[PDB]
Amino acid sequence: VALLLSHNADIVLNKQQASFLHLALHNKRKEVVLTIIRSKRWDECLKIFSHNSPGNKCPITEMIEYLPECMKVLLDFCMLHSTEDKSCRDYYIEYNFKYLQCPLEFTKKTPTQDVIYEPLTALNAMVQNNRIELLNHPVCKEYLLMKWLAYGFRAHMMNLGSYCLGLIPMTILVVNIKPGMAFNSTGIINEEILDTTNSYLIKTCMILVFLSSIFGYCKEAGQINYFMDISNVLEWIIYTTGIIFVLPLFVEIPAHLQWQCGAIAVYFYWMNFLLYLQRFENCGIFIVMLEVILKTLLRSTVVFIFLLLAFGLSFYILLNLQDPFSSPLLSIIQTFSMMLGDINYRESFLEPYLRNELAHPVLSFAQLVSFTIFVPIVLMNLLIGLAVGDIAEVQKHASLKRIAMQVELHTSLEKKLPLWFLRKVDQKSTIVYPNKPKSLEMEILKQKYRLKDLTFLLEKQHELIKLIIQKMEIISETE
Amino acid sequence: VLEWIIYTTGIIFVLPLFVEIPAHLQWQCGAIAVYFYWMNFLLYLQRFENCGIFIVMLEVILKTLLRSTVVFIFLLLAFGLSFYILLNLQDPFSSPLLSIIQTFSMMLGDINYRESFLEPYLRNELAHPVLSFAQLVSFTIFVPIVLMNLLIGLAVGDIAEVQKHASLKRIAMQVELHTSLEKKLPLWFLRKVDQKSTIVYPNKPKSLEMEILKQKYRLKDLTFLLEKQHELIKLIIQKMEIISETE
Ligand SMILES: O=P(O)(O)O[C@H]1[C@@H](OP(=O)(O)O)[C@@H](OP(=O)(O)O)[C@@H](OP(=O)(O)O)[C@@H](OP(=O)(O)O)[C@H]1OP(=O)(O)O
Ligand SMILES: Cn1c(=O)c2c(ncn2CC(=O)Nc2nc(-c3ccc(N=[N+]=N)cc3)cs2)n(C)c1=O
Ligand SMILES: Cn1c(=O)c2c(ncn2CC(=O)Nc2nc(-c3ccc(N=[N+]=N)cc3)cs2)n(C)c1=O
Ligand SMILES: *[C@@H]1O[C@H](CO)[C@@H](O[C@@H]2O[C@H](CO)[C@@H](O)[C@H](O)[C@H]2NC(C)=O)[C@H](O)[C@H]1NC(C)=O
Ligand SMILES: *[C@@H]1O[C@H](CO)[C@@H](O)[C@H](O)[C@H]1NC(C)=O
Ligand SMILES: [Ca+2]
């Protein structure tokens, strides 16, 4: 290949629109690909491919899919150094994002009749093939950081601000008025006396909550699969209760209803804030873990809610004269509370027994032992083991999942921004001053390929030897 | 930071050696000094080899725990601010900050079901009974069960990861200790105390990868030899005599 390139050989496609680079990639010929890369004419070799072909795509995507160790060299070619002296301050590193851009750029014609390329093509190709060693290369890291500081940080701080604009005045209202009291824009109704100090803050916060609820209703009606999501339910509850909490801005309302809606609003607000936090990378793996553990716990209540029924309905009969067990529902809630080890042995079992107030002493003490064995020991250890397994499974894929979240974030953001804006904020390179403020499988695969080549050569040799025997001269050693 | 705090508070604890001082300030500085002294002693202990791996484990677990408070401090806010509204007539929940501290204390399973929920309910002293009992169930599920099991699983993973490299890390600590000590002692002293040999009387008071690598090398040598042989055979064919079997 090097000899044929040194002479001016043409670079064309065939009947399958495959160039020689596609054939070298599909057969995992590493050395010829490295030769094509290290040489001149690499630019035209890269440009020669053609769209519209579902089998022979852009050379970069194919190189990511088949020979990632060559893509690593291709990326190493994109880091330039200045003085090559780590101590110097004018020593800067320049990163070039030449091969991560859209394939529709390489071709000069670019018809794009039916060709639609998704944003961040190279990074998505790396994610869909688990090329974690490539996603950690400094060029890709700087590419993602550039995208972030270019528009992602801003597009998400706007969302956080739009939510906090209703989240913060709610909390300010709660911790500044005594629960149970009625209040309107004029002040606090002390039943009638009217406390009027701090009325300005109260009015401002009541207006900011109202506007946020209205805009949330409008946005959600604009989005209206919908009822299936959980965020939709949470936000519907938040807006419906927050609009009632501050309703005395227009029409009177009983204080009881007002504060019983405030108690739900102020809880679901801060519970929904975690779904906003799950975007950022330093603190979004904990939300994944929390969700996994919560799902695993909820899938087992369909089973381990009959243990509670058994024990609660038996304790309702055995200990019926005591207040905690004086009703079926109260007796089931007390048994749920005893699940962590708070059994009240001395208050519910020993002291009534020494007063001759247990109707069934032997059964009551046998139920205590069987409950202690079954629920605070066996069931809790089962849950702990399940959680340990789930967290290990999540940690096994932490880095790839963390990077894929960011890639998907920016990919989704690209499909909604206007074209001219992306043109304006996009960059082609970056400059950095440092001073200023799975292996064993690959090995055995390679040696399998080597063994197959060995077999092929040995068979050719065998044929040659048989030819020798059938052509030679035999005179003195004839039979 | 630890040593700055220690010295600044220890100098105030014993200041009446020169200038008078109120007893309140003296003992409130002593309470901080006597705590940070014994907390800083562990950083001295972490050098010795029989007991320095536990400090590594402690540090790893503590860092992992502190990286998640930026998240799981909003669960506490949610539950504390809702309990402040639902159970406002009770002393433990009579203020936002007290209500957030009580919720932090309930995280280990000390919920006070009978004292805060059942007995006020049987006296008709709960303002919102159904909501108060629903919050109890959701809290019990979310925090003493899910969050604590999450923390336990994280700790198990971290400790396994630390134990995987225990021996190498243990030896590297000693090597680095002595290396750093060598760069500061005087030359003649190192000459004086260094030895060249030692005498001991006993009586007196990752493999699979290496294997496949070796066999890869063997396979490459085999290929090379086979190619040389192929060339020799082609030479034989192009030099031999052919007379009776000619076409
Ligand atoms: O032609 P090279 O780039 O030098 O690489 C090949 C070989 O390539 P494969 O991995 O495709 O079999 C290995 O290269 P690396 O994996 O190390 O990159 C090998 O490695 P070992 O020597 O460790 O066995 C050795 O390359 P290198 O000497 O750079 O390590 C060898 O080439 P040579 O045996 O002719 O040096
Ligand atoms: C999504 N993502 C990153 O997060 C990221 C990144 N490159 C660096 N970061 C670091 C980072 O976490 N940055 C930021 N964290 C916050 C933040 C943290 C806690 C909060 N809790 N509160 N209140 C609220 C906001 C704001 S900016 N890239 C490429 C990216 O895609
Ligand atoms: C750092 N190191 C070793 O530790 C070591 C060693 N060879 C043997 N040792 C054993 C050892 O632990 N020795 C010692 N342990 C203490 C000690 C223990 C507990 C204390 N707690 N208190 N109070 C205080 C001091 C004193 S001497 N080599 C080569 C080394 O480099
Ligand atoms: C906010 O609530 C206060 C308290 O009820 C309202 O003030 C009362 O208004 C009525 C009607 O004018 C008077 O008869 C009462 O005497 C007022 N109360 C007091 C204590 O003076 C006030 O109108 C409410 N504000 C709004 C906008 O509805
Ligand atoms: C006004 O509020 C105080 C407590 O804030 C209360 O003691 C007093 O009874 C209230 N006044 C009336 C008329 O209810
Ligand atoms: Ca929504």
Integer angstrom CA distances of residue B73 from A3, A208, A270, A274, B147: 66, 25, 10, 10, 11
Q: Cα(A137)–Cα(B125) distance, rounded to whole angstroms?
A: 63
Query: What secondary structure letter does DSSP report for A93?
Result: E
Q: Which helix (H) or strand (E) holds A5?
A: helix A2-6
Q: Cα(A98)–Cα(A251) distance, rounded to whole angstroms?
A: 62
| Binding residue numbers of B | 3, 214-220
**Token pair listed for A477:** 């050693």
- Assess whether the C-beta atom of B49 lies below 6 angstroms from ligand 3: yes
Q: Cα(A247)–Cα(A253) distance, rounded to whole angstroms?
A: 7
Q: Mention every residue, 6+ apart, whose C-beta is less than 8 A from residue A415.
A: A118, A119
Q: Nearest to residue A159, comparing CAs of A239, A286, A278, A285?
A: A278
Integer angstrom CA distances of residue A413 from A181, A215, A273, A428, A433: 45, 22, 21, 19, 29
- Assess whether the C-beta atom of A193 lies below 6 angstroms from ligand 5: yes
Find the closest chain A residue to B213 by CA distance: A443
Q: Cα(A134)–Cα(A61) distance, rounded to whole angstroms?
A: 13
What DSSP string runs through B191-244? Answer: HHH--S-----SS---HHHHHHHHHHHHHHHHHHHHHHHHHHHHHHHHHS--ST
In which order are the strands placed within the sheet that holds A79-81? Answer: A79-81, A93-96, A429-432
What DSSP string runs through A302-313? Answer: HHHTHHHHHHHH
Q: Cα(A255)–Cα(A274) distance, rounded to whole angstroms?
A: 30
Q: Name the residues around ion ligand 6, CB cutoff 5 A.
A: A 232
CB-side neighbour CA atoms (13 Å) of A41: 16
- Tracing tokens 């190493």 back to the chain, one arrives at A76
Ligand 2: distance of its center to the CA of A148 in Å? Answer: 9
Hey, of A171, A267, A464, which one would you mutate to test binding to chain B, going by the most B CBs within 10 A of its CB?
A267
**Which experiment gave this structure?**
cryo-EM
**Token pair listed for A49:** 């491919």
Is A464 in contact with B86 (Cβ distance < 8 A)?
no
Is A264 in contact with B131 (Cβ distance < 8 A)?
yes
Integer angstrom CA distances of residue B186 from B176, B179, B183, B189, B194: 18, 14, 8, 6, 12
A and B: number of Cβ contacts within 8 A: 185
**Token pair listed for A222:** 């604009």
Residues of B in contact with A382 (CB under 8 A): none
- Assess whether the C-beta atom of A120 lies below 6 angstroms from ligand 2: no
- Assess whether the C-beta atom of A191 lies below 6 angstroms from ligand 4: no
Q: Cα(B167)–Cα(B164) distance, rounded to whole angstroms?
A: 8
Q: Cα(A364)–Cα(B179) distance, rounded to whole angstroms?
A: 68
Helix (H, G, I), strand (E, B), or coil: what is residue A105?
helix
- Assess whether the C-beta atom of A157 lies below 6 angstroms from ligand 2: no
E strand intervals along A360-457 = 429-432
Q: Which amino acid is at B145?
A: I
Q: Cα(B245)–Cα(B243) distance, rounded to whole angstroms?
A: 6
- Is residue A329 within 8 angstroms of chain B, CB to CB? no
Q: Nearest to residue A147, comparing CAs of A437, A389, A392, A411?
A: A411
| Binding residue numbers of A | 58, 78, 102, 147, 220, 223, 232, 235, 446-452
Q: Nearest to residue B82, comparing CAs of B28, B139, B126?
A: B139
- Tracing tokens 């092929």 back to the chain, one arrives at A456
Q: Which helix (H) or strand (E) holds B33?
A: helix B23-45
Q: Nearest to residue A323, comparing CAs of B119, B191, B16?
A: B119
Helix, strand and coil percent figures for chain B, each rounded to 5: 75, 0, 25
Which atom of ligand 1 is the closest one to the Cα of B216?
Answer: 24
Q: Cα(A167)–Cα(A9) distance, rounded to whole angstroms?
A: 68
**Token pair listed for B171:** 């030896």
- Is residue B226 within 8 angstroms of chain A, CB to CB? yes
Is A263 in contact with B131 (Cβ distance < 8 A)?
yes
Residues of A in contact with B98 (CB under 8 A): none
Is B84 in contact with A179 (Cβ distance < 8 A)?
yes
- Is residue B91 within 8 angstroms of chain A, CB to CB? no
Helix (H, G, I), strand (E, B), or coil: what is residue A430?
strand
Residues of B in contact with A277 (CB under 8 A): 71, 74
Q: Cα(A115)–Cα(A117) distance, rounded to whole angstroms?
A: 6
Query: What secondary structure letter does DSSP report for A71?
Result: H
- Is residue B133 within 8 angstroms of chain A, CB to CB? yes
- Assess whether the C-beta atom of A178 lies below 6 angstroms from ligand 5: no
Find the closest chain B residue to A293 by CA distance: B146
In which order are the strands placed within the sheet that holds A187-190? Answer: A182-184, A187-190, A193-195
What DSSP string runs through A172-236? Answer: HHHTTS-TT-EEETTEEEE--EEE-TTHHHHHHHHHHHHHHHHHHHHHHHHH--TTTSHHHHHHH
Q: Mention every residue, 6+ apart, whose C-beta is less than 8 A from residue A1.
A: A20, A32, A35, A36
User: Taking every pair of C-alpha atoms in chain A, what is the biggest distance, in angstroms?
Assistant: 137
**Token pair listed for B243:** 């007379």
At A475, give phi and psi (nearest 5°). Answer: -135, -60
- Assess whether the C-beta atom of A6 lies below 6 angstroms from ligand 5: no
Residues of A in contact with B215 (CB under 8 A): 447
Tell me how crowded residue A425 is: count the other CB atoms within 10 A of its CB: 14
Hey, of A177, A271, A274, A478, which one would you mutate to test binding to chain B, going by the most B CBs within 10 A of its CB?
A271
Identify any residues that bridge with A187 across adjacent strands, giving them in sequence order.
A184
- Tracing tokens 């038996």 back to the chain, one arrives at A314
Measured in angstroms, the resolution is 2.6
- Tracing tokens 């506490």 back to the chain, one arrives at B76
Q: Cα(A404)–Cα(A135) distance, rounded to whole angstroms?
A: 9
Q: Nearest to residue A31, comparing CAs of A81, A59, A73?
A: A73
**Token pair listed for A72:** 């690593």
